[PDB]
Amino acid sequence: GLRHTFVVADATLPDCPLVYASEGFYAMTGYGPDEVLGHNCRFLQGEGTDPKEVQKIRDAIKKGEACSVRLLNYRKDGTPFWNLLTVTPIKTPDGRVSKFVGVQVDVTSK
Ligand SMILES: Cc1cc2nc3c(=O)[nH]c(=O)nc-3n(C[C@H](O)[C@H](O)[C@H](O)COP(=O)(O)O)c2cc1C
């Protein structure tokens, strides 16, 4: 989908914290860099987020593999939205994962 957001997480640190987010990520979610750089993206989850979809992502990250999931997420103001998320590992020439990138699409309106 054409409208989307983009983030980079640092896989060389144990909890894959965010190191970069696009202008649209901040604007869509309602958070700014001074609130979410250095943090794992799970802050977007909440009461209704499907733990089985969360587990798929967790498992893909541990295996250094790409994954696509649909997750209920929440803006800073607590309002929900449907996030079609695709995460992709970025490797060094030795095959180790350095970064994960994420593309989010708000698919609430279909
Ligand atoms: C690059 C990247 C982007 C991510 N973007 C989101 C996101 O937009 N929304 C979300 O709920 N989780 C997102 N995650 C998933 C969480 O950061 C975390 O990996 C997931 O919740 C599973 O780990 P946990 O069980 O320790 O929370 C993203 C992860 C990575 C690596």
Residue numbers in the entry: 17 to 126
Verbatim from the authors:
Light–oxygen–voltage (LOV) domains are small photosensory flavoprotein modules that allow the conversion of external stimuli (sunlight) into intra­cellular signals responsible for various cell behaviors (e.g. phototropism and chloro­plast relocation). This ability relies on the light-induced formation of a covalent thio­ether adduct between a flavin chromophore and a reactive cysteine from the protein environment, which triggers a cascade of structural changes that result in the activation of a serine/threonine (Ser/Thr) kinase. For example, in the green algae Chlamydomonas reinhardtii (C. reinhardtii or Cr), phot allows the light-dependent regulation of several molecular processes (e.g. phototaxis, sexual differentiation, photoprotection) and control of gene expression. The C. reinhardtii phot protein consists of two successive photosensory protein modules, LOV1 and LOV2 domains, and a Ser/Thr kinase effector domain [Fig. 1(a)].
The recorded dark-state structure superimposed well with the deposited structure, showing a root-mean-square deviation (RMSD) of 0.15 Å (measured on the backbone Cα over 104 residues). However, compared with the previously published structure, we observed that the Arg74 side chain had rearranged (Chi3 57 to 4°) as it accommodated an altered rotamer of the flavin phospho­ribityl tail. The significant improvement in spatial resolution also allowed us to model Leu34, Val103, Ile73 and Cys32 residues surrounding the flavin in alternate conformations [Fig. S2(a)], revealing system equilibrium dynamics and several water molecules coordinating the phospho­ribityl tail and the phosphate group [Fig. S2(b)]. Overall, the electron density was of excellent quality and enabled us to observe variations in the positions of residue side chains (with an RMSD of 0.189 Å between the dark state at CT and RT). The reactive cysteine (Cys57) exhibited two alternate conformations, as observed at CT, but the variation of the 2Fo − Fc map contour at RT clearly indicated a change in the distribution of each conformation [Figs. 3(a) and 3(b), respectively]. We thus refined the occupancy of cysteine using Phenix for both temperatures. Conformation A, in which the Sγ atom of Cys57 is 3.5 Å from the C4a of FMN, was equally present at RT along with conformation B (i.e. 0.50 and 0.50 for A and B conformations, respectively), in which the Sγ atom of Cys57 is 4.4 Å from the C4a of FMN. However, at CT, conformation A is favored (with an occupancy of 0.70 compared with 0.30 for conformation B).
